[PDB]
């Protein structure tokens, strides 16, 4: 004591809560994923995209849990080598690989499952009835899926305070690095989560695009414009005063697109004024007589007047564009 009390209560919390997690994932597998596989509610391809690696994800946490129990069983001085055995090196890259696949598809899964619940009464009853099983522990399917994420974020918290509570230098260094890996892991995961949300979103738009305006007319650089491999910085509804037009703007990492919304499709109507805009000369200004409107200019001028629904919106918009344009290196 006093360092030691926390060090054991926290090594205990790690074990206990890691087990609890492996039981959840197993409930998720047994009551939901496998049943819907046997019931062929979705084709298998798709179910594998709702739950991107449930089986192997179960195994990585179970293997971790197993290491901690064995180590506990044989005593808790020295735990660093254990931590390092699943968060660092080769096994670390695997844990990152598997965990991140599952997490990326969280948003997908949830909208995907909510849809089948609303469209198909047979599926809603199925879920209703599984969520009512004692083994669920008062959680809903919608509560379970996002736990793999929540877990990942508790790892540095837990490992951080096992470190700061270790009296012995060569062991503290082990736990410290281990916790470092957990931060590297969380950072990588968060990123490929946003890379998935973006990708799926941009893929949607890219097949919904209405390109025939550019294929026809300058501009022949995007004919043929592909946006699936671009970073979506921001998007939003917006009114676009073409003189004294309702539009959906996407601010990408280098282009600004002003898309017209005509049923499912998204038309880039070049209406003397272009609808595609390279940002590396962009610039914004307020409009004095309209606190909801701003100008955008590209240094043969070239003035795009875009009015928002509120002030704070358009304030935000100008900030984001000038930031992104600025983000871009001058050749």
Same-domain status, 330 and 315: yes
In angstroms, the CA 159 to CA 157 distance is 6
CB atoms inside a 10 Å sphere around CB 57: 22
Same domain, 161 and 20: yes
Domain range for 236: 211-331
CA distance 295 to 303: 6
Among positive and negative, which fits the CA dihedral 18, 24, 30, 33? negative
Domain edge (last residue) among 184, 210, 236? 210
How far is Cα 87 from Cα 64, in angstroms, rounded to an integer?
Answer: 9
Residues 6+ apart with CB under 8 A from 284: 294, 295, 296, 297, 317, 318, 321, 322
**Which residue, of 210, 231, 263, is where some domain finishes?**
210
Distance CA 183, CA 269 (A): 45
The verdict on 241 and 309 lying in the same domain is: yes
Check whether residue 253 and residue 165 sit in a common domain: no
Q: Rounded to the nearest 5°, which phi and psi values hold at 35? A: -50, -45
Number of domains in the chain: 2
Q: Do both 156 and 248 map to the same domain?
A: no
φ/ψ bin of 269: left (φ > 0), alpha (ψ from -120 to 50), beta (otherwise): beta
Same structural domain, 87 and 73: yes
d(CA 260, CA 265): 8
Residue 294 near residue 226, CB atoms below 8 Å? no
How many CA atoms, within 13 angstroms, populate the side-chain half-sphere of residue 225? 27
Do 177 and 217 have their domain in common?
Answer: no
- Alpha carbons 1 and 182: distance in angstroms, whole number: 27
Of residues 176, 50, 52, the one with CA closest to residue 110: 50
Residue from 199, 60, 50, 62 nearest 127 by CA: 50
CATH of the domain at 259: 2.30.29.30
Alpha carbon of residue 270 to chain centroid: 33
Helical packing angle, 54-73 and 3-27, nearest 10°: 150
In this structure, the strands spanning 209-210 and 265-267 are parallel
Q: What 3-state class would DSSP assign to 157?
A: helix
Any alpha helices (H) in the chain, and if so which ranges?
3-27, 34-38, 44-50, 54-73, 80-87, 89-104, 106-119, 121-130, 141-144, 147-163, 169-208, 311-326
Please give the full DSSP string across 165-177, using - where no structure is assigned.
T--SHHHHHHHHH
155 and 302 both lie in a single domain: no
**End-to-end alpha carbon distance in the chain:** 62
Pairing of β 255-262 and β 293-298: unpaired
Place of tokens 């501009």: 219
What are the residues whose beta carbons fall under 8 Å from the beta carbon of 15, sequence distance 6 or more?
Answer: 65, 68, 69, 72
* Approach to solving: X-ray
Return all residues near 282 (Cβ < 8 A) that are at least 6 apart. 256, 296, 297, 298, 321, 322, 325
What are 295's strand-pairing partners?
Answer: 285, 305
**Final residue belonging to a domain, choices 210, 238, 271:** 210
Q: Give DSSP secondary structure letters for 210-251.
A: E-TTTTT---TTSSS---TTS-EEEEEEEEEES---EEEEEE
Resolution in Å, one decimal place: 3.2
Do 166 and 229 lie in a common domain?
no
Residue numbers followed by a gap, the chain, C–N over 2.5 Å: 75, 217, 244, 271, 299
CATH number at residue 112: 1.20.900.10
Kindly tell me the sign of the dihedral angle through the C-alpha atoms of 253, 254, 258, 261.
negative
Domain shared by 202 and 225, yes or no? no
- Which helix (H) or strand (E) segment holds residue 257: the answer is strand 255-262
Q: Which two tokens stand for residue 174?
A: 């082990």
Q: How far is CA 228 from the centre of its chain?
A: 16
């Amino acid at each position: 004591p006093k360092s030691q009390v926390k060090r054991q209560e926290v090594i205990s919390e790690l074990l206990v809560t890691e087990a609890a997690h492996v039981r959840m994932l197993r409930v998720l597998h047994d009551l939901f994923f496998q049943p819907m596989a046997e019931c062929l509610f979705f084709p298998l391809e798709e179910l594998q995209n709702i739950f991107p690696s449930l089986d192997e994800l179960i195994e990585v946490h179970s293997l971790f849990l197993d290491r901690l129990m064995k180590r506990r069983q044989e005593s808790i001085e020295e735990i660093g080598d254990v931590l390092l055995a699943r968060f660092d090196g080769a096994e670390g890259s695997w844990f990152q690989k598997i965990s991140s696949r599952f997490c990326s598809r969280q948003s997908f899964a949830l909208e995907q499952l909510k849809a089948k619940q609303r469209k198909d009464p047979r599926f809603c009853a199925f879920v209703q009835e599984a969520e009512s099983r004692p083994r669920c522990r008062r959680l809903q399917l919608k509560d379970m899926i996002p736990t793999e994420m929540q877990r990942l974020t508790k790892y540095p918290l837990l490992l951080q305070s096992i470190g700061q509570n270790t009296e012995e230098p060569t062991e503290r260094e082990k736990v410290e690095l281990a916790a470092e890996c957990c931060r590297e892991i969380l950072h990588h995961v968060n990123q490929a989560v946003r890379d998935m949300e973006d990708l799926l979103r941009l893929k949607d738009y890219q097949r919904r695009l209405d390109l025939s305006h550019l294929r026809q007319s300058m501009l022949s650089e995007f004919k043929n414009l592909d946006i699936t491999k671009k970073k979506l910085v921001h998007e939003g509804p917006l009114t676009w005063r073409v003189t004294k037009v309702e539009v959906h703007v996407l601010l990408l990492d280098d282009l600004l697109l002003l898309l017209q919304r005509q049923d499912e499709r998204l038309l880039l109507k070049s209406h003397m004024l272009r609808p595609v805009l390279r940002l590396t000369s962009a610039m914004t200004r307020e409009v004095a007589t309209d606190h909801k409107a701003f100008y955008v200019l590209f240094t043969e001028a070239q003035i795009y007047e875009l009015v928002a629904q509120t002030v704070s919106e358009r304030k935000n918009w100008c900030a984001l564009i000038t930031e992104t344009a600025g983000s871009l290196k001058v050749p």
